[model samples]
Target: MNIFEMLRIDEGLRLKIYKDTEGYYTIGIGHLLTKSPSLNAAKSELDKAIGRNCNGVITPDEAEKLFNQDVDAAVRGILRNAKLKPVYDSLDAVRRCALINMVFQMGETGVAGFTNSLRMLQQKRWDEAAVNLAKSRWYNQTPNRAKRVITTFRTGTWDAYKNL
Candidate 1:
């Protein structure tokens, strides 16, 4: 599947505001509203983006718009990283989506912290890359998602869609 479909599966859709696994206020497709300057500002931004008063809920079309924006930002974040851009360009489409998926969940800074793992990925050492990813606290926090991502890195395939 494509990155959009994979993210739709992984993040799931939410029309109303809800607490994410980490207890942060989020909306749409994993859009962390808590990251905004303030809840009021976040609400305003959401309303503006969706072109209406959300009133704590959004439409599927609105959610898709937000999702598209978030994904674009994630991609830009990856390309903006001096060290990651070249490695990202070197990877195949599926592998590229894997990196985008990671950046989608964790910002580029967070993914960049995986220095050794990224180095392995850069070198195309799939096994080493997967092993290094598995050792992260991120893995401990989200083993299921991490396992799928790691497997994608290891096999250069869409492990995220294996079961469903």
Candidate 2:
């Protein structure tokens, strides 16, 4: 597959800026545009390249490249946490991806504060971990998405969400 196709599958193609799950202003393949200098720089570069305002976009290939960089940062963010490291490493690939995606969606701080979830995971209590995941605010906001992740982590099967 082409790089664009590969990235589009993983990141979800966003041709224009839109609010993400976390309500952050994200453009083109999950490029978060919070109020920060780095974001400003990225925005400026994109604006310059596209020869339009920040809102002017049909990111396409450029957004795919940005997604690659952001995904790397997300992976690094997941790996660098000392408390999260042990629990993360204990999971199989499916579960690992679920956790990493959670951490990516919710910032490191958001995922780090899941004390009960982390405890259940560390103890290898699959049911408890799934329960904890379901009970979370994240789940409350995105029930179907959480259902899929919780099911995968609980059953070790990358099955589709039942209710969805």
Candidate 3:
């Protein structure tokens, strides 16, 4: 599946505002509206999508649009990093989605902190890369998602998400 489809499952959809695992106010498909650069602009978009002022509820299509924008930001964030771009480009589609998924969960800066793991990925040492990710606190906090992402990195396939 594509990154959007994969993320729809990984992030899950929520039509109403709710607190995320870290207690942040989020909506749509994991859209951290509370942390938006321009909160008004973000809300306005939601309003437009819902055809009225957001009452903390949005339609599925609206949520999907937000998801798309968030995914774009994740992709751009990954590519904008001078050090990470080359490594990201070297990866195949599935592994690329894994990287994007990671960036989506943890910001680009957060993923950048995985120095050794990024190095292993750049070298195409799949097993070592997966091991490095499995060693992270990210893995500890979100084992299921981490496991699936790590498996994709290790095998360079979507088999890890076969049942997802």
Candidate 4:
């Protein structure tokens, strides 16, 4: 079976998986309420399909299915109303990842909520935008995700997201 067929997924799910609720690129489907996937056995195959410590090649339809499965869609409305494509489309791969990683840890609203950070990025004052991450509540709640994103754009020493 193709990836979508294998996952019993659809195009919408794929699209949802691709772009987070914020309309930013989201590489994987995250669990609800931090319900992590198991490494040995994912408890459900869908978890395995949605980047369980590894990238899973998915078809458009599969993406759709994954999208439909996301229960915590609080950010979808924001994505619907805002035109983030201009901002998102402008990002280079690494910057895009670094940004979305922060968005993932902070909800779309939370990520975009940072006026100073957003202003800095809008001005292409990357150094300021990067450091802005250090001064947020998410930095404390999601230290690992915060550290990863911070290291990427802030320190420029991001070898990889380690020990997550």
Comparing 2 and 4 on TM-score, the stronger one: 2
lDDT of 2 by residue, 8-113 (tens): 4445767765666765556777566663345455566567655668554665777766777766776788789887888888877767767766765677888989
lDDT of 1 by residue, 47-120 (tens): 76678888778988888889999999999888889877977998998999889989999888888888898888
Misplaced by over 4 Å in model 4 are: 1-29, 33-83, 155-158, 162-164
RMSD of 1: 2.0
Q: How many backbone clashes does candidate 3 have?
A: 0
Per-model TM against the reference: 0.91, 0.77, 0.88, 0.48
Which lDDT values do the candidates have, in the order given? 0.85, 0.69, 0.85, 0.47
lDDT, residue 54, model 2: 52
Lowest lDDT 10-residue stretch of candidate 3: 33-42
Which of candidates 3 and 4 reaches a greater TM-score? 3
Candidate 2: which pairs clash?
none
Clashing pairs in 1: none
